[PDB]
Amino acid sequence: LNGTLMQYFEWYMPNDGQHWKRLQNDSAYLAEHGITAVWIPPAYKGTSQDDVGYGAYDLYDLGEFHQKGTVRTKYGTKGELQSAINSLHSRDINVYGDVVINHKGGADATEYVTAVEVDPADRNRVTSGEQRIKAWTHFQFPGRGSTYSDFKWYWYHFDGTDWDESRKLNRIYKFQGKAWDWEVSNENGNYDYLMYADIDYDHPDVTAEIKRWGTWYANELQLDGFRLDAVKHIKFSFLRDWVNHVREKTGKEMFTVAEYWQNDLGALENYLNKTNFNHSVFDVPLHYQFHAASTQGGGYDMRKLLNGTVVSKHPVKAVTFVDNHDTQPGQSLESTVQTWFKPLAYAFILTREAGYPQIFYGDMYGTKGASQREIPALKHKIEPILKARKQYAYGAQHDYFDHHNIVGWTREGDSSVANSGLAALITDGPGGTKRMYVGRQNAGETWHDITGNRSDSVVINAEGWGEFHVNGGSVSIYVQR
Ligand SMILES: OC[C@H]1O[C@H](O[C@H]2[C@H](O)[C@@H](O)[C@@H](O)O[C@@H]2CO)[C@H](O)[C@@H](O)[C@@H]1O
Ligand SMILES: [Ca+2]
Ligand SMILES: [Ca+2]
Ligand code: NA
Ligand code: NA
Numbered sequence: 171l172n173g174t175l176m177q178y179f180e181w182y183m184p185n186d187g188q189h190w191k192r193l194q195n196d197s198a199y200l201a202e203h204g205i206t207a208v209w210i211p212p213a214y215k216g217t218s219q220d221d222v223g224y225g226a227y228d229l230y231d232l233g234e235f236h237q238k239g240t241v242r243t244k245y246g247t248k249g250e251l252q253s254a255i256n257s258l259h260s261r262d263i264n265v266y267g268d269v270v271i272n273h274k275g276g277a278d279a280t281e282y283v284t285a286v287e288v289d290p291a292d293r294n295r296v297t298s299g300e301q302r303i304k305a306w307t308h309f310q311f312p313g314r315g316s317t318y319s320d321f322k323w324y325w326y327h328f329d330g331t332d333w334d335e336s337r338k339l340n341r342i343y344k345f346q347g348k349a350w351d352w353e354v355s356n357e358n359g360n361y362d363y364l365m366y367a368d369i370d371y372d373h374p375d376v377t378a379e380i381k382r383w384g385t386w387y388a389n390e391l392q393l394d395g396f397r398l399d400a401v402k403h404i405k406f407s408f409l410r411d412w413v414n415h416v417r418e419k420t421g422k423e424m425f426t427v428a429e430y431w432q433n434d435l436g437a438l439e440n441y442l443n444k445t446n447f448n449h450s451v452f453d454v455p456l457h458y459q460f461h462a463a464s465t466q467g468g469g470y471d472m473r474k475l476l477n478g479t480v481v482s483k484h485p486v487k488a489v490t491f492v493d494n495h496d497t498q499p500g501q502s503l504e505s506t507v508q509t510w511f512k513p514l515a516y517a518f519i520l521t522r523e524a525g526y527p528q529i530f531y532g533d534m535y536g537t538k539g540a541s542q543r544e545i546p547a548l549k550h551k552i553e554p555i556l557k558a559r560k561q562y563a564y565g566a567q568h569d570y571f572d573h574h575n576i577v578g579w580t581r582e583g584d585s586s587v588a589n590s591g592l593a594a595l596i597t598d599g600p601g602g603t604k605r606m607y608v609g610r611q612n613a614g615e616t617w618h619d620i621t622g623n624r625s626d627s628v629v630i631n632a633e634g635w636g637e638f639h640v641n642g643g644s645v646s647i648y649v650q651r
Contacts, residue, residue, distance in 0.1 A: 171587065173526055174204050175266075179211040180532030181495045182539040183495035187221040190246035194254035201261035203553065204280060204560030205529070207425070208258060209397045212268040213243065213251055217276030222245055222495070223268060224399065225275040225366070228311050229383050230318045231367045232390065237313035238276060248390075255392055264394035266425065267387060271412075272381050272400040274323060275366035279305035280335050283325045285569050287615070292359035293342060293350055298412070303343055304335035307367050320388065321379050323497065328367045348372075353444060355402035359521060364403040371405040381412055384417040395425035398449070402430050403435075406444040413448050427489045427526075429449065431496070433458045435478050438440050442487060452527065453480040453488045456504070460492055460518075464511035468599030468643075472577045475518065485524035492516060493530050499543040500530075506545065513551045513621070514596035514645045520559040521594050523567045523645060529556070555647065562649045563618070564590040567606050575599035576640060582609035593628075593648040595640035610634035617648040627651070 178193055212223025215231035219240035231237055232248040255265050283305045287298040309323035330344040332650050342363055351371045355361035397622040401409055417424050426449035430441050456479040480488040492515045498501035507515050517528035536547035565582035576597040583591030593606050608630055617628045624646045628636040640646045
């Protein structure tokens with residue numbers, strides 16, 4: 171009954187074209203462990219076969235056409251993806267497709283374009299006169315032709331680019347007659363520009379096309395929802411309208427979560443407000459608190475976890491997580507939650523009542539970068555916590571964030587889930603004990619730590635209290651034997 175998301179990729183997976191098959195073969199395991207939705211990496215052709223998917227060369231090529239030196243994407247063919255999705259749907263697992271619509275990379279040809287340079291720290295400030303550049307802006311899709319869509323892209327569908335091919339120079343160029351879109355993040359004055367060729371969401375043909383592609387993509391992969399990439403760089407009213415449009419055309423709920431990357435509740439609340447709360451956001455501040463706690467050796471005040479997060483103020487609109495493909499070691503938003511703390515963070519998102527929690531493929535199975543800082547496979551430490559969510563994390567919650575290190579919470583259980591109820595403790599410092607209330611309805615039950623970290627049983631007293639233990643730097647989740 172509790173919903174659990176899984177991000178089903180990490181940055182450094184091998185480029186062997188087997189990922190979709192792997193996903194298909196993992197669907198039984200996912201369903202058995204209580205995963206109810208998966209966020210899949212971008213499924214369309216990037217700038218090369220080894221593109222993780224954020225290059226977004228051709229949104230209508232789901233590993234179906236020979237373009238950029240390959241038919242398959244990094245992950246496999248369209249048919250393989252569709253077979254994975256029908257296996258997941260057979261076990262009632264929803265599929266959320268990644269939507270990369272900020273930009274297009276890997277244009278087929280250059281165009282001569284008049285542009286001005288802008289200040290990378292303040293993109294409202296122009297720093298040159300008009301100059302002629304060669305920008306990678308012409309998309310003809312030679313391998314696809316007009317199959318599924320005859321829409322071709324040219325420079326006038328974009329606001330700018332970061333590369334002049336004639337001078338071989340990396341600068342932010344704004345094209346003649348274009349304006350950065352608004353509303354976007356006010357970072358760097360205006361953060362419309364991120365990378366590759368930036369889509370002009372002032373252009374009416376572009377807005378129409380991206381909306382109609384959205385519907386096509388949903389049908390083609392029978393998607394149940396979306397993950398929106400890089401939303402702080404995309405006109406907010408457009409994203410709002412795009413989500414409404416696809417819901418209207420498909421007739422489905424289409425759960426949507428947006429990646430608005432800022433460690434600031436205020437900015438995320440502005441985004442929610444400007445999109446009329448029609449979709450969720452990832453709980454980026456909560457991630458940064460996990461990272462902080464994990465790197466401060468007990469010095470962090472664990473009471474802080476209850477404030478300044480999306481889930482603390484808008485729980486229905488928060489997707490909580492520990493790490494992702496951008497925060498993992500080596501990546502562009504690196505802020506990895508250290509290994510020792512990771513299970514405590516998973517207990518916080520998985521066993522508490524608020525928020526839609528998401529598990530990271532990289533945490534389950536490890537990351538496969540070339541460093542010696544990779545996340546190790548933590549599947550066996552996460553599995554018990556997933557089981558706690560699936561079977562035990564129901565009913566009224568009681569919080570005990572009354573200590574700098576040792577904090578906890580209980581769930582009373584619900585009569586609709588037999589034997590449900592839990593008592594969780596985490597500590598970023600020394601271990602110890604805490605008496606917590608689990609409900610008089612659980613009086614006399616004998617509870618045990620589902621993680622196996624503590625071997626002691628706890629008998630709930632007549633008044634509904636148990637004396638629970640946790641080891642140093644550890645997590646324990648007690649549930650009924
Ligand atoms: O996991 C499948 C489940 O996901 C969504 O439910 C979310 C809900 O939208 C959020 O507001 C939040 O409270 O968490 C829920 C999952 O625990 C879909 O809305 C729902 O239809 C779907 O079954
Ligand atoms: Ca943009
Ligand atoms: Ca524009
Ligand atoms: Na733009
Ligand atoms: Na602490």
